[PDB]
Amino acid sequence: SDIPTPLVAVYADESCLGNGREGENPGGAGVLVEYARPGGAGDIVRRDVWVSEPATTNNRMALRSVIEAFRAIGHKGTRFRVVFTTDSRYIVDGMTRWVHDWAQRGWKRKSGAIENLALWQEAVQAVNGHAVEWRWVRGHAGHAQNEYANHLAVTAAGGQTQSGGLVDSGYEEWAARVSTAASRMRLEPFPDAAAFRPSPALPVVAAGRPS
Secondary structure, three states: OOOOOOEEEEEEEEEEOOOOOOOOEEEEEEEEEEEEOOOOOOOEEEEEEEEEEEEEOHHHHHHHHHHHHHHHHHHHOOOOEEEEEEOOHHHHHHHHHHHHHHHHOOOOOOOOOOOOHHHHHHHHHHHOOOEEEEEEOOOOOOEHHHHHHHHHHHHHHHHOOOOOOOEEOOHHHHHOOHHHHHHOOEOOOOOOOOOOOOOOOOOOOOOOOOO
16 A cells, blocks of 8 residues: 555636637636644645636636646655645546546547647646545635635736745635625635545556647
8 A cells, every 4th residue: 555645635726817709818727725734733734826828718727727736746755645626627527537538539639629638638647646536616606715716816817927836825814804704605624534535547648649
């Protein structure tokens, strides 16, 4: 069995701003990472990671949320166990189902389709050897961490900034805002290593073949 690894809970969102046609709007991806010290008092340590593109799509940004998240945690010398919660069914269904279908078909594109296949391959690689439980929640529905992540995504889109990796979180300050309070949101408690039900490992991509 497996050597000890850390457990984190990740909350991701994406957003585009504006009303231009698909692919013309600025966009952002926002990620909150929660970490509770094993044996600790239960206080949550939070870090944020965001990126943006000036003309992009919601699907692309959703994929970047995954890639950026897993890349940042990947840099700590260990595989991780991750509970990844997002508003994007595109990500959840893709990671749990579709990538397997795509791999099965040789990662070949369908003509006329725009499936973001290159990004999916990057995302699958980013996830790597980490063990992930993929979870969906509705957006804009009162899940506090999800709403924060959205706030981060929008900020990223608006400012056209990037964190470059994990940075100290703004969650606590955001949580205390009057706007946040009026929303009457619900916080998700940190997961039990019992709550942890990872998905199967992803197909190792067949790099270098034509679409």
